[PDB]
Amino acid sequence: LKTKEEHQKEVQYEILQKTIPTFEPKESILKKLEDIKPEQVKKQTKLFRIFEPRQLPVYRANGEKELRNRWYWKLKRDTLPDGDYDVREYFLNLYDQVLTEMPDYLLLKDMAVENKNSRDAGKVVDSETAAICDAIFQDEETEGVVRRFIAEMRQRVQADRNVVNYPSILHPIDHAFNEYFLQHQLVEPLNNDIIFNYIPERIRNDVNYILNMDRNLPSTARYIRPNLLQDRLNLHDNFESLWDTITTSNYILARSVVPDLKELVSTEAQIQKMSQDLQLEALTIQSETQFLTGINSQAANDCFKTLIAAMLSQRTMSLDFVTTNYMSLISGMWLLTVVPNDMFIRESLVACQLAIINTIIYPAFGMQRMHYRNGDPQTPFQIAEQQIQNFQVANWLHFVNNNQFRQVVIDGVLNQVLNDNIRNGHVVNQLMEALMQLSRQQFPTMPVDYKRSIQRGILLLSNRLGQLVDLTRLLAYNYETLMACITMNMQHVQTLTTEKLQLTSVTSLCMLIGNATVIPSPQTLFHYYNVNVNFHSNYNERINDAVAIITAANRLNLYQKKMKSIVEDFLKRLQIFDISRVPDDQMYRLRDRLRLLPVEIRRLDIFNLILMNMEQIERASDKIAQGVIIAYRDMQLERDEMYGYVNIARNLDGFQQINLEELMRTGDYAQITNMLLNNQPVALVGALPFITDSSVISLVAKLDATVFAQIVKLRKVDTLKPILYKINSDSNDFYLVANYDWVPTSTTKVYKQIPQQFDFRASMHMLTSNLTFTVYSDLLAFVSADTVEPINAVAFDNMRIMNEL
Amino acid sequence: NSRDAGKVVDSETAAICDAIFQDEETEGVVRRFIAEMRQRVQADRNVVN
C-alpha cells in the first residue's frame, strides 16, 4: 500500500504534467530567463538596394544592332519563381529579408567615399553609387549639363548642428526603403532625466536606498526605448495551461532575488525547550519524534523564498501538513494571517482552516465539532466568525476572512498590494491577543495530558510577540520593494499546478527567527529589474513579429501556409515554453487572438512599401512572363526598341482571362480543354517562365502554337513554357526579314513589360542623417547605488523594521 | 491536393481522395470538389469538423 498509492499518483499526475509547458527540471528555467539578451541593435553598412543600372543593346525599326548602347534599370539577384502563388510566397520572404535587415540607427558619415572625378572634394554615399557616378561622366551619350553637374555635387557637413547630407543615385523603389530607415530611427535622445525616471518609483523614493548619478552623459547620447506595454494577449482568462509557466518561471526568477536570512536562533537551542514545553514523551501520543522534524535552519530560508516568490509572482500554494502535529497547526495560524487567504488553493485553504477549528479552536470553547460539506461557498473561518463567542478570536477571524490582495494600479502596472495593517505588523498583536486567551481556556473534555501539552504549544508562539511583529514587518517589506521592481502585469488567477508549502517548515520560521534584518542589495534589485524589462520587452517584440506575419500572410492572399507554424516559433523565441506539451485548444486560441491585434506602426509601413511595389518588381524581372495571350489568328509582331521584332503584348484587352492559379488548385481543366480543341482565343494569365529563340525559320514554321497542346494530354500545367521571338541582325537567318517582301506574323503573343530607362534627374537625390551617435544599451549601469547599513533600515513608516534590537 | 493543406479524417479516406483525383476519367466537378475539402476548427468551443 506504500508503493501502490504513490505509483497510482505519478501515473495520474503525469497526465496533467504532460499538458503544462514547464520544463521537467524546475530550476533550469532560471538560466533561460537571464540568458534573454535585451535587443540586437543593427546598423547597416551598405545602402539597401534592389535595382542596379545595366547596359542593354538597342535596336531601331527594321531591327538592327545600334552603335549607341543605352542604360536600363534591370534588377539584380532576380530569383523569381514560376507560378502565381510562388511569386507571392517570394514576396513574403522578402518581407522577412527586410525586417531582419531593418537598421535601428543609421549614420551616414561611415558610408562615404570620394567622388574621383569631382573638382571640389565631394563625397557620395556608396562605393556602388560612386561606381555609377563615374560611368555617367565617361559616356558620350550623357548631356553636357550632367557631365558638368556630377563633378559639382557637394555634400554639406554641419558638425555643430550635427546634421549631414550626401548625394546619391537610387531607384525610386530603392529610395523609399532607404528614406524610411533614415527618417524613422529607433534612437531617442537621452539625458539625466530619463535615467532618473527609468528607476522605479518606490526604490527611488525609498530612504534606505541612496542612489547617485556619477557619470556624465553628453549631448549626443541616444538610446533604444523598450517596447513596454501590458500584455495585449490576455494570457490569463482562457489559457489555463499557457499561463502555468508564466507563473512558474516568474516564481523561480523571483526565488533567486529574495535574500538569505542571517543570525537565526540556533537549531539545538530552540528544540531543547520545544521538547520540554510540549512534553512529548510523557504523552500517550503515537508520533513522538515526528513533531520537530522539519525545524531546520535550511528550511527557515525555504519558507522565506517560497512565501515571497509565490506571492510576488501569482502562484497559488497548496499546504502540506499532518493534522496530528498541532505545533505545525498553531504556527499555521500565523500563516493565514499574513499571507492573504486567496493565495492558497481553496481545497487546501479549507482543509487547513477546518483543521485549526476542529481540533484547537472549537474544542477550546466546548462547542461541537464542525461538520462541513465541501461544496459550501463559506470557508470554515467565515462560519466560526459568527458561531464563536469571544471577541478576541472573533476579531481575529474577521481578519483572516477579510484579507486579500487589494488591487491597485501604480506607475502604469497593476500590482496586488497588501493592506496597511499587515505591512506594518500590527495584525499580529491581534493574533497573539486571540492566541493568549485560547491558552487560558479549559478544554472541557480534552484529556489533561493533551490539554497542557497544547496550551504550552500555544505559549511557544504567543511568547514570541516581539519577533513575529518583526518578521511580518520584514516579510512585507521584501515583498514591498520587489513588487515595484516588476514591469509585467500582476494578474491573480487560480493556477493549474501549485507550489507546495509545508507547514512543518513554516514552524521553522516563526520560532527560529532572530532580530537581524535582510534587505535586497541594490545591485541585486537592479538585476531583477533588467530581467523583467528584458522579458517584457521581448514578449512584446515577438508578438509584433508574429502579428506582422499572420496579417502579411493574409493581405497577400497567401493560403496553404499553416498558422500553427508561425505561432509555435513565437513560443520558441520566448525562452520559457516548449512546444511539445502545449495542447491544441491553446495553439488555436493563440492563432485566433494574434489575428485581431493591429500591426505595429513601423512593420506595417514597410509591408505597405512592398505591397504597392509588388507589381514593378515582378514586371521588371526576366525569366518569367505574366501570361500568354493566345489568339489563333494572324497578327504582326510589334517593333520594339530593345528587342527588334518581338511578339509582345502590353495589355490583356478584348480577350478572356483565365487564372492559372485557379486552374491549378481546382484541377478543373474542363474549360481550358474545350477552349483549345476549338480554336477560340484565350488569354492565359499567371507567372509563366518563357523561352527565347533568335531564328526566323522557327517563326515561319510556327513553333509558338505547339506549346499549349501539352495541357490537354497531360493535365498538369506547371510544365508550360510560352515562346518569345526575338529577331535582330545578330540572329541567324535574319535575311528573310530584310530581303523578302513579307511582314512577320505570330498566332500568339506574350505579355511582358519593357524595363525602365535610366533618367538621371529623377534618380539623383540627397540623403540626410546625423553625424555622430553613441548608443547606450544599459541604463541602470549609470546610477551608483548604495544600500544603508541594515540595522538602520526603515519600513514605509519611518520606524525601523526588526525593532527588537 | 487541396486549396489549403487541410486534414481529411482517415488514411483510407485520403487513399480514395487522390485515387479519384489522379484518375483521368473522373469528371472535373468531382475533381474540383476534392480541392474544397478541408477541416474546420473552432477553439473557443473545442470542436473540429
DSSP annotation of A255 = G
| Residue A210 DSSP SS3 | strand
Q: Which helix (H) or strand (E) holds A163?
A: strand A163-166
Q: Do A666 and B46 touch (CB under 8 A)?
A: no
Q: Which residues contact A321 (CB under 8 A, 6 or more apart)?
A: A328, A329, A332, A352, A355, A502, A503, A504
User: Do residues A758 and A136 touch, judged by C-beta distance below 8 A?
Assistant: no
Interface check for B29 against chain A (CB to CB < 8 A): the answer is yes
| Residue A501 DSSP SS3 | strand
How many domains does chain A fold into? 1
Select the residue from B7, B41, B45 to test the A interface by mutation, using most A Cβ atoms within 10 A: B41
Calpha distance A74→A701 (Å, rounded): 32
Kindly identify which residue of chain A lies nearest to residue B36, measuring between CA atoms. Answer: A666
Q: Which helix (H) or strand (E) holds A594?
A: helix A590-596
Interface check for B38 against chain A (CB to CB < 8 A): the answer is no
Half-sphere exposure of A519 (CA within 13 A, CB side): 21
- Region class of A486: left (phi > 0), else alpha (psi between -120 and 50), else beta: beta
C-alpha cell of A726?
Answer: 526575338
> Which one of A238, A559, A669 has the shortest CB-CB distance to B28?
A669
DSSP string for residues in A367-392: PPP----TT-SS-HHHHTTTS---SH
Q: Distance (Å) from the C-alpha of residue A589 to the closest C-alpha of chain B?
A: 5
Q: Do B3 and A560 touch (CB under 8 A)?
A: yes
Calpha distance A118→A111 (Å, rounded): 18
Chain B residues in contact with A553 (beta carbon < 8 A): none
Give the CA dihedral A339, A511, A309, A252, nearest 10 degrees: -150
Interface check for A585 against chain B (CB to CB < 8 A): the answer is yes
DSSP annotation of A114 = E
User: Do residues A684 and A649 touch, judged by C-beta distance below 8 A?
Assistant: no
| Residue A767 DSSP SS3 | strand
Interface check for B23 against chain A (CB to CB < 8 A): the answer is no
Q: Do B41 and A670 touch (CB under 8 A)?
A: no
Q: Which residues contact B34 (CB under 8 A, 6 or more apart)?
A: A667, B1, B2, B17, B20, B21
Select the residue from B2, B26, B27 to test the A interface by mutation, using most A Cβ atoms within 10 A: B2
Interface check for B43 against chain A (CB to CB < 8 A): the answer is yes
Chain A residues in contact with B46 (beta carbon < 8 A): 585
Burial level of A150, CB count in 10 A (0-12/13-18/19+)? buried
State the count of interchain CB pairs (< 8 A) between A and B: 39
Method: cryo-EM
Q: Which residues contact A547 (CB under 8 A, 6 or more apart)?
A: A594, A597, A598, A599, A600
> Which one of B2, B28, B43 has the shortest CB-CB distance to A670?
B28
DSSP annotation of A357 = I
Q: Do A588 and B21 touch (CB under 8 A)?
A: no
The resolution of the experimental structure, rounded to one decimal in Å, is 3.6
Chain B residues in contact with A560 (beta carbon < 8 A): 3-5
Q: How far is CA A623 from the centre of its chain?
A: 40
DSSP annotation of A100 = H
User: Do residues A389 and A428 touch, judged by C-beta distance below 8 A?
Assistant: no
Q: Distance (Å) from the C-alpha of residue A587 to the closest C-alpha of chain B?
A: 9
Interface check for B47 against chain A (CB to CB < 8 A): the answer is no
Task: Count other C-beta atoms under 10 Å from residue A114's C-beta.
Answer: 11
- Give the structural domain span for A785: 1-805
Q: Distance (Å) from the C-alpha of residue A491 to the closest C-alpha of chain B?
A: 21
